[PDB]
Amino acid sequence: EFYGPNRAKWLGPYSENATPAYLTGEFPGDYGWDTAGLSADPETFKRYRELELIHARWAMLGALGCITPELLAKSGTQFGEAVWFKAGAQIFSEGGLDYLGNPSLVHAQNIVATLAVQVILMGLVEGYRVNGGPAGEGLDPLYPGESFDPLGLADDPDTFAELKVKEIKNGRLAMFSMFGFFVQAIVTGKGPIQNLDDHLSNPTVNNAFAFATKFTPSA
Amino acid sequence: EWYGPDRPKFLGPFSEGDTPAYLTGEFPGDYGWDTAGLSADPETFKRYRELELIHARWAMLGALGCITPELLAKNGIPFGEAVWFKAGAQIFAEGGLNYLGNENLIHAQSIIATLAFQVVVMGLAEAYRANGGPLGEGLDPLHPGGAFDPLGLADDPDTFAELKVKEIKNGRLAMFSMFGFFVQAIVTGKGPIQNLDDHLANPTAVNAFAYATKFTPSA
Amino acid sequence: TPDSFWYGPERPLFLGAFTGEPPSYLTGEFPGDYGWDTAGLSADPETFKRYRELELIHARWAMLGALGCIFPELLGSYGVPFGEAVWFKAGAQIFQEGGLDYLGNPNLVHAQSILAILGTQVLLMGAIEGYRVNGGPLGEGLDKLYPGGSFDPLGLADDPDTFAELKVKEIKNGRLAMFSMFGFFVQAIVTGKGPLQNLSDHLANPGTNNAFAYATKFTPQ
Amino acid sequence: LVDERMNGDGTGRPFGVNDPVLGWVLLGVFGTMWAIWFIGQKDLGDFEDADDGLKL
Amino acid sequence: MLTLKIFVYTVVTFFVCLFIFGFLSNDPARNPGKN
Amino acid sequence: MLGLGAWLLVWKAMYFGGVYDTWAPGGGDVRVITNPTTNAAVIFGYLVKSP
Amino acid sequence: GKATRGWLGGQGGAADLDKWYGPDRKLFLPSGLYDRSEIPEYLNGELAGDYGYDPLGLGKDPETVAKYRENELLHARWAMLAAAGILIPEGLQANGANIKGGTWFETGAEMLN
Ligand code: CHL
Ligand code: CHL
Ligand code: CHL
Ligand code: CHL
Ligand SMILES: CCCCCCCCCCCCCCCCCC(=O)OC[C@H](CO[C@@H]1O[C@H](CO[C@H]2O[C@H](CO)[C@H](O)[C@H](O)[C@H]2O)[C@H](O)[C@H](O)[C@H]1O)OC(=O)CCCCCCCCCCCCCCCCC
Ligand code: CLA
Ligand code: CLA
Ligand SMILES: CC1=C[C@H](O)CC(C)(C)[C@H]1/C=C/C(C)=C/C=C/C(C)=C/C=C/C=C(C)/C=C/C=C(C)/C=C/C1=C(C)C[C@H](O)CC1(C)C
């Protein structure tokens, strides 16, 4: 499965007729779901796959990155701020920004120098991803190869065509979960692990319906 | 009239100087307004007609259900606070959520029961709308007929091709009026009949320009 | 097409040397083609035409909007007695007791009714946007977005090289304004002040009147 | 206050301007003379070239 | 006296701008020499 | 080379003992310049001032 | 094989081998003090680090020089870690990371008994 006609699909068994023609099943993650009809052009459908995988890979680093400064707070490690969305504002703090509870670490103080180094560093590696760089030029734009896969996992192409499906399914789970983290923090105001503890405290009373009457027009 | 290359259009006399060549007149509701060029692909234009028609049907169900708890409120029907954009919070009242005013009616307190019932009902029902099933399979995805035309009205193919235009024109301003009701509740904060009562009290003074300086950013 | 440095395969690109090669349908014969359609919205040549009048009219409104939002605000700081000089607080001048006096001068326009302003705006903007689509007394069969003729009175779009050069200047001055007019919206929601009042404060202390002093403004609370 | 004056000699105002009409006089005359020069640049030779000055 | 000060600034910056935009207008090729 | 040479005077006035400040209270004295006036309207006010 | 790309520009690979190898290469003195006839003939531009710097004629022929390359390269690579091994714990000792013995010469005296 996961390729060809008898792959898994987005309505399970009730999905043999909603699948369009162009979503055949030779790409990874191809469950045949274009209800909005957006990818009827293969020159355009090639471009959204470029966007989806990169959004998938930034979200997998976004999910774990928003979690580990709060799980390590549950191990008692002092951070100055452990909540993910309040984490950026502590370069304005008096001690500044230490990488853990260690003022002998990075000890950042100036926000504008931290941003300006990012524009040069991220600006040049995102340009290498497009055209080419020190780690190779004429490669696959999404699965480039050897310097980013040192461990040789991209061999035996039946495994390699299967690890891609592991990559996108883990990835689509992350983008869905990161869209969680914004909403559950813009509504509640607390962290995700903290709001997990609020639900595991009393699940019947701690749901989104406890905040359902929040955004009402008070006029 | 209503079809062919002599249908009425969305600017009238000015409209004939810019109308898209891929819009011909072979579908109901063609007034030649695709200036953004979004439906130039005939495959996507197949899908956008399906997205338009379903949105219209929930709007025609929606727009009628937003005012019937308010017209009955001025005809002496005992409701518990029947205004559509805050009637969802009636389930957290202490008497459950009785339907008209009467406790021997539905009397729903646990929203977890009525939610999970809905997603199983609407899960199979929306799944059957795409693939088919117990109310026919091999039918048109927009107008199946038969089980959904019991009253025989979808005959006389010179009349059925004109009830479509009545289906979508009545459908379009219902979509335009639910986009009405949303904004007139965000800004004002009262039911649309209460807005319509207040506009008729003084149309020169009480209109939308009284609320024009509401969202000025005080900082 | 001549050697004009902006049209053709040697044209400059939106990432410089790191662009590589543009998409296969952006071949460099339309103004402002730096080859940036990474999301590929306009692969259909029927659809790609539809974004260009959609871009150019947005430019020709934003360039009026960029000058129009600051020029009463600039003169307001030099003693011209406006009702309000700030662009997003100038729409509510119809509700004050003196009416909307143009230039702050009571013997000018002196508008009173907001309905009369809007009643004659639609009856005019309907006709001239109607004339822009087709017809109209100033030209019958012309281009949809470079009509010329009575819309080029000074006659400075006649040579096919100079006119192909000034189309590049129009869209780049346009794309400068649309990006900047987007900036007026965000730094008025955030800062709450007029846009030069934001400028005269950043020139006061640049280290502390930057945008990061407003970074904790929308904290969930 | 037996009379009215500029009172603006020791003030050190920039370019000597004290009324903001002077800044528009300083700038508006400048832009007009620039505008006539920029239009008439078409006659002054086109040195869009590698090296085309009064060289030696 | 303000009416006089706004007039001198129009006069001076007229003639100062004929100077600056005069020497820019390819003066080093306004010579009788040949090449 | 004279951009960097300007900074040597800046570094010696903020880190390396400072310079002789004759407007010190109670006679002139060496003061480390801690808060240099870097306002553009203050700095460029000297250049377009009359002589 | 490795079709690569330059860091800033648009072309990778070797910048210039002729800047460092062969007859024309950087030397320990410029051209005005040291011409190409004063080069010892057992130093030709075919190894790295060949600035021709050998006033004391310790090397004789490139076979003898090659075993001193073993003494040169191995003394290099153990020293390069030592410079990081000395400076890095002392700064962490300075900022607040308690090494208790980050300073390099009295490190062993901290761990005796
Ligand atoms: C046969 C049963 C079956 C059904 C009914 C579905 C249905 C669905 N699958 Mg599928 N699947 C099913 C079997 C299977 N799926 C999959 C694998 C997948 C994948 C990988 C994915 C899906 C997805 C989807 C969704 C696509 C449509 C959608 O996004 O709706 C969205 C719209 C609604 C659900 C309706 C609106 C929400 C809510 C119910 C309304 C309630 C309103 C709120 C209370 C308040 C409103 C807020 C206001 C106030 C502001 C849909 C929920 C996609 C998905 O997960 O999308 C997120 C998707 O990525 N399925 C497998 C494994 C092979 C199946 C095995 O049998
Ligand atoms: C001959 C004159 C004539 C004119 C001027 C129009 C114009 C229009 N028709 Mg058409 N029609 C005309 C003849 C006819 N129409 C139709 C049938 C239809 C239909 C079915 C539809 C239209 C629609 C439209 C609209 C589509 C263009 C648009 O989207 O505007 C976009 C531009 C504007 C709206 C400009 C804004 C004007 C206004 C002054 C804005 C006010 C600004 C705010 C006060 C401040 C801003 C708020 C900020 C704070 C966020 C437009 C209003 C469509 C529609 O209803 O869309 C809503 C539509 O569905 N027409 C028929 C029957 C055949 C006609 C007869 O000749
Ligand atoms: C051309 C577009 C247009 C825009 C962007 C605005 C915007 C505004 N008007 Mg205005 N108007 C516009 C046209 C017109 N207005 C008026 C008459 C008035 C009056 C009487 C008043 C305003 C007021 C306002 C301000 C509301 C304060 C605010 O939004 O908070 C800050 C937030 C922002 C500035 C962000 C706004 C950006 C915008 C939402 C996104 C831009 C895209 C729009 C959706 C496009 C809309 C065009 C459509 C209608 C075709 C706001 C600046 C009120 C005011 O003066 O405020 C004190 C007010 O009292 N307008 C007329 C005559 C009928 C117009 C003609 O078209
Ligand atoms: C402005 C105040 C400021 C100061 C005083 C420091 C100083 C420090 N930084 Mg930090 N940083 C500061 C802000 C910032 N840093 C960084 C990014 C980093 C990185 C990537 C690293 C540091 C490291 C360090 C620590 C050196 C550790 C060591 O023992 O030396 C060992 C190093 C040497 C012996 C050689 C370098 C000597 C010198 C200490 C330079 C290191 C400092 C920074 C690179 C920037 C220089 C700041 C100036 C004002 C002293 C030390 C606490 C290092 C660290 O985290 O080690 C635990 C390190 O790797 N900082 C950014 C983002 C650009 C900042 C902006 O606000
Ligand atoms: C208390 C405060 C008081 C403040 C007082 C104000 C003081 C201001 C001091 C400013 C001092 C600057 C003086 C030096 C300017 C030098 C300009 C120049 O050498 O200029 C040389 C260049 C030449 O430009 C080139 O000109 C070329 C000309 O080509 C033409 O000519 C070519 C051959 O000549 C070919 O023939 C070709 O076909 C043809 O098109 C092309 O156009 C090029 O694209 C173009 O880059 O000009 C340019 O880049 C000029 C770029 C800068 C322009 C600045 C304009 C500023 C305007 C401010 C607002 C004024 C408002 C005015 C309103 C008026 C109405 C009231
Ligand atoms: C996209 C374009 C745009 C838009 C929509 C606006 C919108 C607005 N501007 Mg702005 N503006 C813009 C561009 C724009 N501006 C630009 C580019 C400039 C620079 C020239 C200005 C300069 C400007 C000033 C200086 C002022 C405005 C003002 C206004 C407001 C009212 C406009 C008005 O009174 O019209 C009426 C104007 C006209 C109908 C045209 C001018 C007519 C004058 C009065 C001469 C009259 C002609 C003749 C002598 C009399 C007829 C004969 C008679 C005797 C019978 C409104 C918010 C006013 C305000 O309060 O904002 C803060 C204001 O004072 N605008
Ligand atoms: C204006 C300064 C200047 C310039 C442009 C040059 C340029 C040159 N020199 Mg000359 N030279 C200079 C000063 C200068 N020199 C001085 C001051 C001395 C006396 C030490 C010499 C002695 C000298 C000799 C003897 C020779 C050259 C040679 C050369 C050529 C380059 C080869 C080379 O690396 O230089 C060689 C010189 C050095 C590598 C000196 C080291 C330079 C240090 C590392 C730079 C320090 C810069 C620092 C910021 C300055 C401090 C600030 C302040 C004191 C100003 C080139 C034509 C060679 C040549 O032409 O070949 C025939 C050559 O044989 N130069
Ligand atoms: C498919 C389809 C089909 C049909 O046809 C149509 C439709 C329906 C339309 C479609 C759908 C779609 C969708 C659903 C989408 C979504 C997406 C997403 C959500 C993404 C995210 C995405 C997301 C993402 C990236 C994210 C990322 C993140 C990150 C990095 C983070 C970072 C961070 C961290 C670490 C921490 C600190 O403290 C801070 C921060 C900074 C915060």
From Swiss-Prot, chain D:
Lumenal, thylakoid side: 1-19
Subcellular location: Plastid, Chloroplast thylakoid membrane
Membrane-spanning parts: 20-40
Residue intervals on the Stromal side: 41-56
Signal sequence segment: none
Record's function text: Stabilizes dimeric photosystem II (PSII). In its absence there is a reduction of monomeric PSII.
Protein family according to the UniProt entry: Belongs to the psbW family.
Assembly, per entry: Part of the photosystem II complex. PSII is composed of 1 copy each of membrane proteins PsbA, PsbB, PsbC, PsbD, numerous small proteins, at least 3 peripheral proteins of the oxygen-evolving complex and a large number of cofactors. It forms dimeric complexes.
Name of the protein this chain belongs to: Photosystem II reaction center W protein, chloroplastic
Organism of origin: Chlamydomonas reinhardtii (Chlamydomonas smithii)
Gene this chain is encoded by: psbW
Residue window of the full protein shown: 60 to 115 of 115
UniProtKB/Swiss-Prot annotation, chain E:
GO biological process: photosynthesis
Null allele phenotype: Able to grow photoautotrophically only in dim light, oxygen evolution is 10-20% of wild-type, reduced accumulation of protein D1 (PsbA).
Subcellular location per the Swiss-Prot or TrEMBL entry: Plastid, Chloroplast thylakoid membrane
UniProt cross-references to SUPFAM superfamilies, sorted A to Z: Photosystem II reaction center protein I, PsbI
Primary location group: plastid
Pfam families named among the record's database cross-references: PsbI
Superkingdom in the source lineage: Eukaryota
Keywords, alphabetical: Chloroplast, Membrane, Photosynthesis, Photosystem II, Plastid, Reaction center, Thylakoid, Transmembrane, Transmembrane helix
GO CC terms of this entry: chloroplast thylakoid membrane; photosystem II reaction center
InterPro entries referenced in this protein's UniProt entry, alphabetically: PSII_PsbI, PSII_PsbI_sf
Entry's transmembrane regions: 4-24
The keyword Plastid is assigned to this record: yes
Membrane association type: Single-pass membrane protein
Family assignment from sequence similarity: Belongs to the PsbI family.
Assembly behavior: PSII is composed of 1 copy each of membrane proteins PsbA, PsbB, PsbC, PsbD, PsbE, PsbF, PsbH, PsbI, PsbJ, PsbK, PsbL, PsbM, PsbT, PsbX, PsbY, PsbZ, Psb30/Ycf12, at least 3 peripheral proteins of the oxygen-evolving complex and a large number of cofactors. It forms dimeric complexes.
HAMAP family according to UniProt: PSII_PsbI (MF_01316)
Role, per record: One of the components of the core complex of photosystem II (PSII), required for its stability and/or assembly. PSII is a light-driven water:plastoquinone oxidoreductase that uses light energy to abstract electrons from H(2)O, generating O(2) and a proton gradient subsequently used for ATP formation. It consists of a core antenna complex that captures photons, and an electron transfer chain that converts photonic excitation into a charge separation.
Protein name per Swiss-Prot or TrEMBL: Photosystem II reaction center protein I
Species whose genome carries this gene: Chlamydomonas reinhardtii
Lineage: Eukaryota, Viridiplantae, Chlorophyta, core chlorophytes, Chlorophyceae
Name of the gene encoding the protein in the UniProt record: psbI
Swiss-Prot record, chain F:
Modification after translation, per record: Phosphorylated in vitro.
Location within or outside the cell: Plastid, Chloroplast thylakoid membrane
Membrane spanning residue stretches: 12-34
Record-stated family: Belongs to the PsbB/PsbC family. PsbC subfamily.
Subunit structure: PSII is composed of 1 copy each of membrane proteins PsbA, PsbB, PsbC, PsbD, PsbE, PsbF, PsbH, PsbI, PsbJ, PsbK, PsbL, PsbM, PsbT, PsbX, PsbY, PsbZ, Psb30/Ycf12, at least 3 peripheral proteins of the oxygen-evolving complex and a large number of cofactors. It forms dimeric complexes.
Protein task: One of the components of the core complex of photosystem II (PSII). It binds chlorophyll and helps catalyze the primary light-induced photochemical processes of PSII. PSII is a light-driven water:plastoquinone oxidoreductase, using light energy to abstract electrons from H(2)O, generating O(2) and a proton gradient subsequently used for ATP formation.
Protein name as annotated: Photosystem II CP43 reaction center protein
Organism of derivation: Chlamydomonas reinhardtii
Lineage summary: Eukaryota, Viridiplantae, Chlorophyta, core chlorophytes, Chlorophyceae
Gene this protein is translated from: psbC
Portion held of the full protein: 155 to 205 of 461
